[PDB]
């Protein structure tokens, strides 16, 4: 039951993977970091989970799909599937955690859905503000002529989010923890604490910040990745014997929306001013006049949706 074929040559996918202080071919305790839209690996995790996971005993690794995750999401997924295949064997055929933010969570779940070979190679998934259903703040699909391919695909009602949904991709495939906020200014809707939210996965550990820390708790898109509450939740997921964050680990002791306590003062300042969410506004990306066609492995699950070739059919 082979994997679908990569549209990209494997050497191009290998050029996006980097382990801090080790080689991806031979590494002990790796963790895969998948960045958000408009960012590279370092731009997303420089001030937070690259130094934080290193203190927890992991070798930080990450992918940086070019250019800044603005290309087709299904191509960004190839970088991740190649990265886990590499890191899993690189640690001697041992599962590894994967930690994501924004489109990274949608990339992680796309790869787990359509590339079965990696499903038993990810130990657990820890996703901060993932947009599995996309976002409504991306505008209507009929006013994005020229916008980046991934911006088309993360627009609510896209063929990509439709196919992921109908393929069974809104169910956790490996042990997953999703930490998100109702006050996410990038990903909406996030207010229901229910399967209506873009970050919700069926059977996962879905942690909406306001459900733990109260409705008046305010935490933005970037804060969802760097807050002390995010660190304590993220650390519970990684150390858990269930592979999901445990409600007994974190609690209301931890409801602090500022950069993680174990960060340095320099790394706390950089995390409190992280503009990566809005970095894309200045970066030049690809041009796209219609939603990118779905790869043949996902086309059946979005029948009736409109992409560049026309209305998808069986
Ligand atoms: Ni983002």
Author numbering: 4 to 317
Question: Which passages does the manuscript contain on this structure?
Answer:
Here, we choose lipase B from Candida antarctica (CALB), as the model enzyme, in which Asp187-His224-Ser105 is the catalytically active triad. Lipases function according to the classical Ser-His-Asp catalytic triad mechanism. In the present study we propose that the Ser → Cys conversion in lipases may lead to high activity by accurate manipulation of the local environment surrounding the hybrid Cys-His-Asp triad, enabled by laboratory evolution. We succeed in evolving cysteine-CALB mutants that are even more active than WT CALB.
Surprisingly, Cys105 in variant QW4 appeared to be oxidized to the respective sulfinic acid. An extremely high catalytic efficiency was observed for the purified variant QW4 (kcat/Km = 5920 s−1M−1), with kcat increased by 6 folds and catalytic efficiency (kcat/Km) increased by 40 folds compared with WT. While the helixes of QW10 and WT CALB are well superimposable, the helix section P280-Y282 of QW4 is deformed and shifted toward the active site, with an additional H-bond between Y281 and E188 formed. In striking contrast, the potential energy surface scan for QW4 disclosed that the acylation reaction follows a two-step mechanism involving a HisH+/CysS− ion pair, in which the proton is first transferred from the thiol group of C105 to H224, and then the negatively charged thiolate anion acts as a nucleophile, attacking the carbon of ester bond of the substrate to yield the tetrahedral intermediate.
